[PDB]
Write a protein that binds this DNA or RNA. Structure first.
Lengths: 729, 676, 511
RNA sequence: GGCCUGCU
RNA sequence: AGUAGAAACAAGGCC
């Protein structure tokens, strides 16, 4: 007998066993070297799918830009980025007709947000390409460097702590005849100048990288990261787009998984049960090929201009700016390329900027073709990527266009027996088309395809299929007359998260409890998940039961603690104690569960505030792990782990001292202002001015009614006067 | 005093002087987040790879003067090397366990107060009482449900200001806490945290957890309570229910909500059954709410609602007096009355007998969203004052009062098909049928009532047929008002009788309750109802009803197969097919039933004919009373979301298809049991 | 206000028939729908369409597999060809010093000979493998002489191990301005992997991975005491699961891989410049009840200066076996095979005296591969979860608990592989072990080809299931889907076997 | 031989 | 040699 697990599908349906078709127990595919090749490939593709457009030379950047809007109509079933402005505007008009008042209310909400939002909100983000160092840097690091360089140049409106003032400064930096940046060497610094075009290409450029740990693809794809200048305008645009998508029953992007399933089920119910039995109904469970490549930012600008009609011109401009920057965006090629000489046994790293000048003898025919094709677009080491968006920066607006296309089948606009509706999240859609016969179904799916090609949205025929209503798939959710649990997407989340010991226990038992609630994980599987998680936890953190003979570097202290203690059921798994977790106790932390069994000496040592291990920085990160909210108790096991410590060998050493002393400063401010941690401080007053004035008021109020007598009040006032004098001088 | 000296020391250095001078307060976050350390894309690999090096964790530098460099075995606990961007020192994990075996001690009494929510969860679970596990299909309906169990009904922004007023009274800003609830919360909470020395940030996050509301879409069946959703991983599964009763003393609002929903559902199911009283009693015994049985709450809890009163009266108990009408609760306050057993005609010329009452009498109307006071005479209204909340509430109260008046102005307004027979072929109460007819719109009752003059006393507002106040001429007897509450609350409980069809009565002979007074509304329980019965799909819906009916008949096929042959009338007259009977045309209920019974009879008569698929398909249609006929049917329609889905008698269908290869039956795309 | 440079950029970011942002804004503000979509649809060519091609039983063709030399073993340790020396020592899973346990497990074998080469590597220097074996033996005897066994032993850096572990093989790093006119200076080799055809040995490895054994391989941690009835139900379910699964070679591979990857990661982090000897240990528990320790061989970790998650640490693996390398030589392309001893097993024809070979090879791993193979126990979750789903899906049907009937009465049977006579069905336990072995092999042979093929064949599986349900399914480009599936079948044994399985499934379905 | 780094 | 597969590792830099 030869064993075949796939034959299991001869008795169990494919959706009730789809977890078997998910190889999510092994290393996900990773990239190894440069990502220049994929960046060039994407540039050449997105310039190929729009080649019948019109060419231009930008007067500001000097880059060759391809405009496919209002271009010729496609003649074959290949991908096309030739979107039609009139059709986009008609889609928006019919969208407003079907949901009246949606754009007005969304614009009002976004105006309120624009008026209220602050610059600190840009600190909550991923890596951002800092244009001052030409390096990916954390969002707060990039914001700080940009703010510093602006203040070094005279654009200090951003000190208002409002996002719109930071955007006014970003826009006013381009009308300057010379930027001023600083570069490190070896350790000191050097001043450098940037003419208008250099700063323009630096503000408009995007960084490129390969995306690691992607499940479900044989070949690697590239992704982009924008700078600080485009992130505020994109924040406002994404705010508007979310606000719109919230009011549409056909959008699916701004909502979670469970409400996504609810929406899908409601739509399927509407199309099956309400409609008569005579009509047929077919579900296309489809995807979109090259979704981002064909999404021109000029049609996002047109959509924004339509949405912001009859509105203050300032709001229209602030929301229009982001598409304007994306239309002129540049893409950094990547890391570069490595050359090996086998006879001489040597290697060499060439940067991507040299590709414009480098001889082409050293490249394989594929790279020779890519470089030769892309060289015209290369301006100062970056390729003009105007013809389309890269990897969904405008995700919510793409979902808005998709919901418009889904809303264009209501049967009031088709004016025919067939109609359609569905749910789309960017790059993936499910379409229920209802019609009286198979010719009507074919005509409805042809009109859907064609109306999708007039907006630059291409349907993947290789990865899409149409069946009867009742069975379909949407974002790895398999609906078969009702939704079905998968549990294979959530399998890599069933181990030690890797924050610390307390957080790992909390996150592991909350992930078990959630998978029990949401993904129909069983009771026995949940108990075994507990057991295996605890085994991994003990092995990873060298914290074994203590009645064992496992020799580790931390196996001696655990036995001394085990032997000191009389009540051994009160010890934490992190200190060498038993496991009291079960199904009933998945919603309780490990410190409160064992609290009544603990000894008072151990109980007071563990939960000691003076411990040198617990540090908490901000209210947002106290019990939140990238997002997994995890209820936990602050104990001595809540340490922070160590840092990369690889900056010591690089040109950038002065950031460590700057950040150590900035943390000093922030701690002193927290001493002066107790609520600097809870509520992010707001104001416009300088550090020393606020600190000295606050201290002065405290001394005055203490003298009037408090401990402070004349001596200490006078001393404080004199010292504060000294601080003010030293500040002014 | 120390802090200002620290500030002089920071200001002394020129570089720190430029950091303090240039940085504005708005940027406090940015420089707090300024760090070279990139966030770990793969934290697991970075804590599995990192936990194999000496000194993998970090700690404050005070550890260097509190813990020794090595233990008795000689293993190092900390190093003199510093973290990358910090003054903190690199230490081994042996510094943690050493701290737990030989470090300083304190008093941890503060922590129970600090982490109140978690200890309340522990106390609620420790005292809970489990019971039998019931293996049954779980209809988990995705719904937004409140996760937090101590939420004081304050939003995150709403409660951040109370948290600040409690912990940080000088940094609150312009926000004045107007609401009294916030003000009581502030005074009470301030006392508990007088000296807490954990951290004011942790005390603020504590008050965030206790006070901040939180909602999450979750697949929920039953439950819906704060204390029953925190254990949703333990109470609810895919095929199993776990009876559970948290430890915390339950609020009685939730309990009475569940009591009314349960009583409504039961009363509705009882109306359509064959013997409503027996079924009602058996179901109330076999059902429980929040763990506690239904009888316990019904004997202990006094609650005013029609279904609860019917349930109580069926248990031979006291029941509140002050008869009700059209869902409203009437209390007479003056006069006698006698019925007359008289006859009259309508505006649509239909003849009818009714019982009109004697004497002048005043009444105190009460309701869910309205209130009124009425004075009338024999067949004649005298005056009506109303106290509704919304305009349609006043309209409801006014039409109810007009119907109660029994005036010919109302009798000569009835127009259309108003048949006084129920789904069960039970003649219906006339009064409720009129009151249901005049609830679509009572336009004809308004243009046919009459007109009188008014003295314009008190500055009272005029009446509205269609939102037209008339301050000098108005409906006759009818007034406009808006009281806060009815005259006074009635609490005098009476003895009653009940017919089989739940027509409650009083000692004199008048009518007191009926299954028509119960609401037509469909609510969502706050506590998990454990309506234990073979049929739990009472309110589930038609698709579930069909699938589960076919599943039941599959599971109990072994005894239905022998009851179908011997004594089949108690199989047709069975308490399991009544939800299916709720479906299937109301007119062709009898024709379909007789058809199917004749099929089964001629299938039993001739030998050599037996198809289990036919019986399992057509049995739910033979439940109804048999109406004879001469025709035949090729399909059978069933109402699903207003659409008539057709079930094919011969062969498979989208509603009923039995695979002959794998022997699985499938209802509506859902498996409904293997067939033998 | 928009002004200056950002106005000009605004004028060059509009459709092509516009020259000013203000004219475009006026056109939009005056735009009113007047039937434009329908018109451009009428102008659009009718060749651009999405005609639905029906999908019937005769429509789907088999998946084509590549042609080429047969595929060779890729795993980091032997799966079915592995051998165990044992001492029967009462020491729990980790309660020992690996090197002392290894010495005890090696002392119990007598029959050692002078090693000689049997199957050469054919690309390497087999005398170096011979010398490396002899060095390992010398160092083990040296450890034996020492009064206290080192917890971690380093190895000498001889030329055989410098070669066998890839030492001073990386090229030197220079500046591009110093190597330009070099003849053979070119880009890294970036070509299609070498093609490889499916072989018969992977199916036999999978057949034996699904087999029972005479020992227990999983001792789980403890949990709280069960207080609710559903906890008792879950505990009985878990006991049945562990009973069925604990006697299975898949769990043995789980433990081997977890131990080996833990040891490799820890040795790599702790000793980065030194070479280190790491015994292959696994502690089972025979059905009688005595616990046993088992040694499969040795690893020799090279240096491990691993920066990126893809950086490679090289090691030399040596494993004992009884399988002759001359019966399936294409399976051992990357292996050198020596002859190391003789063994007399339990025979009824006197004693057999079969020889005993050592499979020696150079291999490598990364931080991520180590991390992901040290967590193969999640496979037990995947499998058992699917099983539990099935059980609960049946318990809802029959209003009663279904663990005992399923696991004991064995009445239910699921097709779980085809015999020459036809499709063969198995009991719930065989299904459990089959899914566990599938997940374990997914973990051992994980590659981007597996991901790609899994997705692209999931799509076809779902289309075939829609066809099986009589839901009149259809497609728009099926040959593209096939070309996307077949694009991932290149050289991986596991992926080619999955493709063969999919072909067999399509053959047995659609009837 | 000694020291710096292990995502920069 | 080996890992690996559209580009990399098989240590890197500073004295």
């Amino acid at each position: 007998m030869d064993v075949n697990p796939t034959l299991l599908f001869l008795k169990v349906p494919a959706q009730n066993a789809i977890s078997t078709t998910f190889p999510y127990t092994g290393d996900p595919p990773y990239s190894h070297g440069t990502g220049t090749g994929y960046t060039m490939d994407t540039v050449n593709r997105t310039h190929q799918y729009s080649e019948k457009g019109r060419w231009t030379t930008n007067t500001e950047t000097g880059a060759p830009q391809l405009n496919p809007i209002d271009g010729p109509l496609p003649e074959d079933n290949e991908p096309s980025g030739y979107a039609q402005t009139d059709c986009v505007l008609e889609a928006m008009a019919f969208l407003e007709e079907s949901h009246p008042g949606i754009f007005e209310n969304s614009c009002l909400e976004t105006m309120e947000v624009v008026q209220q939002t602050r610059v600190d909100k840009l600190t909550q983000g991923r890596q951002t390409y800092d244009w001052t160092l030409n390096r990916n840097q954390p969002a707060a690091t990039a914001l700080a460097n940009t703010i510093e360089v602006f203040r070094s140049n005279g654009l200090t409106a951003n000190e208002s702590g409002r996002l719109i003032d930071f955007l006014k400064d970003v826009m006013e930096s381009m009308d300057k005849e010379e930027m001023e940046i600083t570069t490190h060497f070896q350790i000191g610094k050097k001043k450098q100048r940037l003419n208008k075009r250099s700063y323009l290409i630096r503000a408009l450029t995007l960084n490129t990288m390969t995306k690691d740990a992607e499940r479900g693809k044989l070949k690697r794809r590239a992704i982009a990261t924008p700078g600080m200048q485009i992130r505020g305008f994109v924040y406002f645009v994404e705010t508007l787009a979310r606000s719109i998508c919230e009011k549409l029953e056909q959008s699916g992007l701004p909502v979670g998984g469970n409400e996504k399933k609810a929406k899908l089920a409601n739509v399927v119910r509407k199309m099956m049960t309400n409609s008569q039995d005579t009509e047929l109904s077919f579900t296309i469970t489809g995807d979109n090929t090259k979704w981002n490549e064909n999404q021109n930012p000029r049609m996002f600008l047109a959509m924004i201009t339509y949405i912001t009609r009859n509105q203050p011109e300032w709001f229209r401009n602030v929301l229009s700016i982001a598409p304007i920057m994306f239309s002129n965006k540049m893409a950094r090629l990547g890391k570069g390329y490595m050359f090996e000489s086998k006879s001489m046994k040597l290697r060499t790293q060439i940067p991507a900027e040299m590709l414009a000048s480098i001889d082409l003898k050293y490249f394989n025919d594929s790279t020779r073709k890519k470089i030769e094709k892309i060289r015209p677009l290369l301006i100062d080491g970056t390729a003009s990527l105007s013809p389309g968006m890269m990897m969904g920066m405008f995700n919510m607006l793409s979902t808005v266009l998709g919901v418009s296309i889904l809303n264009l089948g209501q049967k009031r606009y088709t004016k025919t027996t067939y109609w359609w509706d569905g749910l789309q999240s960017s790059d993936d859609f499910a379409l229920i088309v209802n019609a009286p016969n198979h010719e009507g179904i074919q005509a409805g799916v042809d009109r859907f395809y064609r109306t999708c090609k007039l907006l630059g949205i291409n349907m993947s025929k290789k990865k899409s299929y149409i069946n009867r209503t009742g069975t379909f798939e949407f974002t790895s959710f398999f609906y078969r007359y009702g939704f079905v649990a998968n549990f294979s997407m959530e399998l890599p989340s069933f181990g030690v998260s890797g924050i610390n010991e307390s957080a790992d226990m909390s996150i592991g038992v909350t992930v078990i409890k959630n998978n029990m609630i949401n993904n129909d994980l069983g009771p026995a599987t949940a108990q075994m998940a507990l057991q295996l998680f605890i085994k991994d936890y003990r092995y990873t953190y060298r914290c074994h039961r203590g009645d064992t003979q496992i020799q580790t570097r931390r196996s001696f202290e655990i036995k001394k603690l085990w032997e000191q203690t009389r009540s051994k059921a009160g010890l934490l798994v992190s200190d060498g104690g038993p496991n009291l977790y079960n199904i009933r106790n998945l919603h309780i932390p490990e410190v409160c569960l064992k609290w009544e069994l603990m000894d008072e000496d151990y109980q007071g040592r563990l939960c000691n505030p003076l411990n040198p291990f617990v540090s908490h920085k901000e209210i947002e990160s106290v019990n939140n792990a990238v997002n997994m909210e995890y209820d936990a108790v602050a104990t001595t096991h809540s340490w922070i782990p160590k840092r990369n410590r690889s900056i010591l060998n690089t040109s950038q050493r002065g950031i460590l001292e700057d950040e150590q002393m900035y943390q000093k400063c922030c701690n002193l401010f927290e001493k002066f202002f107790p609520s600097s941690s809870y509520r992010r401080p707001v104001g416009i007053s300088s550090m020393v001015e606020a600190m000295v004035s606050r201290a002065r008021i405290d001394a005055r109020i203490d003298f009037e009614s408090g401990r402070i007598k004349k001596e200490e009040f006078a001393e404080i006032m004199k010292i504060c006067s000294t601080i003010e004098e030293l500040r002014r001088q | 005093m120390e802090r200002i000296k620290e500030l002089r020391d920071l200001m002394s250095q020129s570089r720190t002087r430029e950091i303090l001078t240039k940085t504005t307060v708005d940027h406090m976050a940015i420089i707090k987040k300024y760090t070279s350390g990139r966030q770990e894309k793969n934290p697991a690999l970075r804590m599995k790879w990192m936990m194999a090096m000496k000194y993998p964790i970090t700690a404050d530098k005070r550890i260097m003067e509190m813990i020794p460099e090595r233990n008795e075995q000689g293993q190092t606990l900390w190093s003199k090397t510093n973290d990358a961007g910090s003054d903190r020192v690199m230490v081994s994990p042996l510094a943690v366990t050493w701290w737990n075996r030989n470090g300083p001690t304190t008093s941890a009494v503060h922590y129970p107060k600090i982490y109140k929510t978690y200890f309340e969860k522990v106390e609620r679970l420790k005292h809970g009482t489990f019971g039998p596990v019931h293996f049954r299909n779980q209809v988990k309906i995705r719904r937004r449900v409140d996760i937090n169990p101590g939420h004081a009904d304050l939003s995150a922004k709403e409660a951040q200001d109370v948290i600040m007023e409690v912990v940080f009274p000088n940094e609150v800003g312009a926000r004045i806490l107007t609401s009294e609830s916030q003000l009581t919360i502030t005074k009470e909470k301030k006392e508990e945290l007088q000296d807490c020395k954990i951290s004011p940030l942790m005390v603020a996050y504590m008050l965030e957890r206790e006070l901040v509301r939180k909602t999450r879409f979750l697949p929920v069946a039953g439950g819906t309570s704060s204390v029953y959703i925190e254990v949703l991983h333990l109470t609810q599964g895919t095929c199993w229910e776990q009876m559970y009763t948290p430890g915390g003393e339950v609020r009685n609002d939730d309990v009475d909500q569940s009591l009314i929903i349960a009583a409504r559902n039961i009363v509705r199911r009882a109306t359509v059954s064959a013997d409503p009283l027996a079924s009602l009693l058996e179901m109330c015994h076999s059902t429980q709410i929040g763990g506690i049985r239904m009888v316990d709450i019904l004997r202990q809890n006094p609650t005013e609602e029609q279904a609860v009163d019917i349930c109580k009266a069926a248990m031979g108990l006291r029941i509140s007096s002050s008869f009700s009408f059209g869902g409203f609760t009437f209390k007479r306050t003056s006069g006698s009355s006698v019925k007359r057993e008289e006859e009259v005609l309508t505006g649509n010329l239909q003849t009818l007998k009714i019982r009109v009452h004697e004497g002048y009498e005043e009444f105190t109307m009460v309701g869910r969203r309205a209130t009124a006071i009425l004075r009338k005479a024999t067949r004649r209204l005298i005056q009506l004052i109303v106290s509704g909340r919304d305009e349609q509430s006043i309209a409801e109260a006014i039409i109810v009062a007009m119907v109660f008046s029994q005036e010919d102005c109302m009798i000569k307004a009835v127009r259309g098909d108003l048949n006084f027979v129920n789904r069960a072929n039970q003649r219906l109460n006339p009064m409720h049928q009129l009151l249901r007819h005049f609830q679509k719109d009572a336009k004809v009752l308004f243009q046919n009532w009459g007109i009188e003059p008014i003295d314009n006393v008190m500055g009272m507002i005029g009446i509205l047929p269609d939102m037209t106040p008339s301050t000098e001429m108005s409906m006759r007897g009818v007034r406009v008002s808006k009281m806060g509450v009815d005259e006074y609350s009635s609490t005098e409980r009476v003895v009653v009788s009940i017919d089989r069809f739940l027509r409650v009565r009083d000692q004199r002979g008048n009518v007191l309750l009926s299954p028509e007074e119960v609401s037509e509304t469909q609510g969502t329980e706050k506590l998990t109802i454990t309506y234990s019965s073979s049929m739990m799909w009472e309110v589930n819906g038609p698709e579930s009803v069909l699938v589960n009916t076919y599943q039941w008949i599959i599971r109990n096929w072994e005894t239905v197969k022998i009851q179908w042959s011997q004594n089949p009338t108690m199989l047709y007259n069975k308490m399991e097919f009544e939800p299916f009977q709720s479906l299937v045309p109301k007119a062709a209920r009898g024709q379909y039933s007789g058809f199917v019974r004749t099929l089964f009879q001629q299938m039993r008569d001739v030998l050599g004919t037996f198809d289990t698929v036919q019986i399992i398909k057509l049995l739910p249609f033979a439940a109804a009373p048999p109406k004879q006929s001469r025709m035949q049917f090729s399909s059978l329609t069933v109402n699903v979301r207003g659409s008539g889905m057709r079930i094919l008698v011969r062969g498979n269908s989208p509603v009923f298809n039995y695979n002959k290869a794998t022997k699985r039956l499938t209802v509506l795309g859902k498996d409904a049991g293997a067939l033998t | 206000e928009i002004t200056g440079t950002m106005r000009r950029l605004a004028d060059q970011s509009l459709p092509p028939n516009f020259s000013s942002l203000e004219n475009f804004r006026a056109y939009v503000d005056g735009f009113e729908p007047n039937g434009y979509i329908e018109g451009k649809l009428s102008q659009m060519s009718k060749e651009v369409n999405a005609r639905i091609e029906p999908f019937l039983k005769t429509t789907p063709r088999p998946l084509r597999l590549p042609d080429g030399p047969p595929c060779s073993q890729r795993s980091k340790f032997l799966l079915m060809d592995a051998l165990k020396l044992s001492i029967e020592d009462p020491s729990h899973e980790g309660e020992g010093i690996p090197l002392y346990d290894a010495i005890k497990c090696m002392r119990t074998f007598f029959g050692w000979k002078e090693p000689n080469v049997v199957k050469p590597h054919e690309k390497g220097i087999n005398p170096n493998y011979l010398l490396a074996w002899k060095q390992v033996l010398a160092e083990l005897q040296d450890i034996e002489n020492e009064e206290k066994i080192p917890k971690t032993k380093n190895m000498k850096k001889t030329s055989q191990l410098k070669w066998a572990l890839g030492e001073n093989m990386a090229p030197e790093k220079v500046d591009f301005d110093d190597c330009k006119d070099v003849s053979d200076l070119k880009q890294y080799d970036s070509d299609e992997p070498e093609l490889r055809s499916l072989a018969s040995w992977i199916q036999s490895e999978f057949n034996k991975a699904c087999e029972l054994t005479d020992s227990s391989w999983i001792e789980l941690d403890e949990i709280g005491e069960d207080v609710a009835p559903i906890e008792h139900i879950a505990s009985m379910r878990r006991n049945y699961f562990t009973a069925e699964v604990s006697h299975c070679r898949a769990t043995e591979y789980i433990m081997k891989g977890v131990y080996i990857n833990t040891a490799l990661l820890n040795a790599s982090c702790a000793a980065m410049d030194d070479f280190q000897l790491i015994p292959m240990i696994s502690k089972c528990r025979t059905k009688e009840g005595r616990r046993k320790t088992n040694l499969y061989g040795f690893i020799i970790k090279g240096r491990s200066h691993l920066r990126n998650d893809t950086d490679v640490v090289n090691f030399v693996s040596m494993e004992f076996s009884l399988t002759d390398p001359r019966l399936e030589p294409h399976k051992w392309e990357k292996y050198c095979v020596l002859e190391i001893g003789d063994m007399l097993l339990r025979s009824a024809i006197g004693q057999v005296s079969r020889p005993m070979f050592l499979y020696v090879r150079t291999n490598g791993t990364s931080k991520i591969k180590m991390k992901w193979g040290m967590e193969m126990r999640r496979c037990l979750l995947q499998s058992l979860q699917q099983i539990e789903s099935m059980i609960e899906a049946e318990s809802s049907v029959k209003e009663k608990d279904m663990t005992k009937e399923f696991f004991e009465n064995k009445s239910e049977t699921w097709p779980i592989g085809e015999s020459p006579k036809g499709v063969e069905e198995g009991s719930i336990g065989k299904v459990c072990r089959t899914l566990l072995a599938k997940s374990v092999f997914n973990s051992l042979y994980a590659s981007p080809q597996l991901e790609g093929f899994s997705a692209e064949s999931r799509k076809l599986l779902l289309i075939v299931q829609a066809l099986r349900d009589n839901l009149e399914p259809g497609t728009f480009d099926l040959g593209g889907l096939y070309e996307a599936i077949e694009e991932c079948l290149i050289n991986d044994p596991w992926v080619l076997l999955n493709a063969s399985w999919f072909n067999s499934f399509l053959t047995h379905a659609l009837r």
